[PDB]
Amino acid sequence: GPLGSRNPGGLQIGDLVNIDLDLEIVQSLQHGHGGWTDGMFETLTTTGTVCGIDEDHDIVVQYPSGNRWTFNPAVLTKAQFQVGDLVQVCYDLERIKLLQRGHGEWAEAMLPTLGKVGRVQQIYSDSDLKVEVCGTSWTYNPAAVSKVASAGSAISN
């Protein structure tokens, strides 16, 4: 069936989902189903894990960055630093192109890394970083990435 024809309850916690859609369509469908913020660019290139269904029947999805985002079910398709640090790549394409000048440069094959998390593999003497993002390592300006706190502040049970 077409987009939106999935049976309610056809996704459960632990299911893997992706987004195949263009941003503009995601934004339309997100109206009244949680909206869009640019922090969500991760979701267009990362496989998420269903972690809940809210009262209004929208799907809450968990990302390796630690972030959880709420989606219209129709959007989803069922599927300073230290070495080892989990870091998130800047999602702003314009900014990152400028930061990458002289710091490893921007290659178009890096486009999917926007907004994604990866792992620091090596820190160069001049402070640039080798970061592995979904199996491929790139050189980044450290200003082009942020240390990730998965869950953030501690919450008592």
Please give the angle made by the CA atoms of 7, 9 and 11, to the nearest 5 degrees.
Answer: 95
Amino acid letter, 121: Q
Query: How many CA atoms lie less than 13 Å away from 23 in the CB half-sphere?
Result: 8
The candidate with the shortest Cα–Cα distance to 124, out of 110, 137, 140, is: 140
Q: Are strands 77-78 and 16-18 parallel, antiparallel or unpaired?
A: antiparallel
- Classify the phi-psi angles of 32: left when phi > 0, otherwise alpha if psi is within -120 to 50, otherwise beta: left
Query: What is d(CA 22, CA 2) in angstroms, rounded to the nearest whole number?
Result: 16
Q: Which residues contact 90 (CB under 8 A, 6 or more apart)?
A: 96, 99, 114, 115, 144, 145, 146
Structure determined by = X-ray
Cited resolution, angstroms: 2.1
CA distance 136 to 113: 10
**Closest C-alpha to 46, from 121, 115, 110, 147:** 115
DSSP labels, the chain: --TT-SPTT---TT-EEE--S-HHHHHHHHTTTT---GGGHHHHHS-EEEEEE-TTSPEEEE-TTS-EEEE-GGG-EE----TT-EEEE---HHHHHHHHTTTT---GGGGGGTT-EEEEEEE-TTS-EEEEETTEEEEE-GGGEEE--SS-S----
Instruction: Please say whether the beta carbons of 99 and 91 come within 8 A.
Output: no
The whole-angstrom separation of Cα 63 and Cα 133 is 14
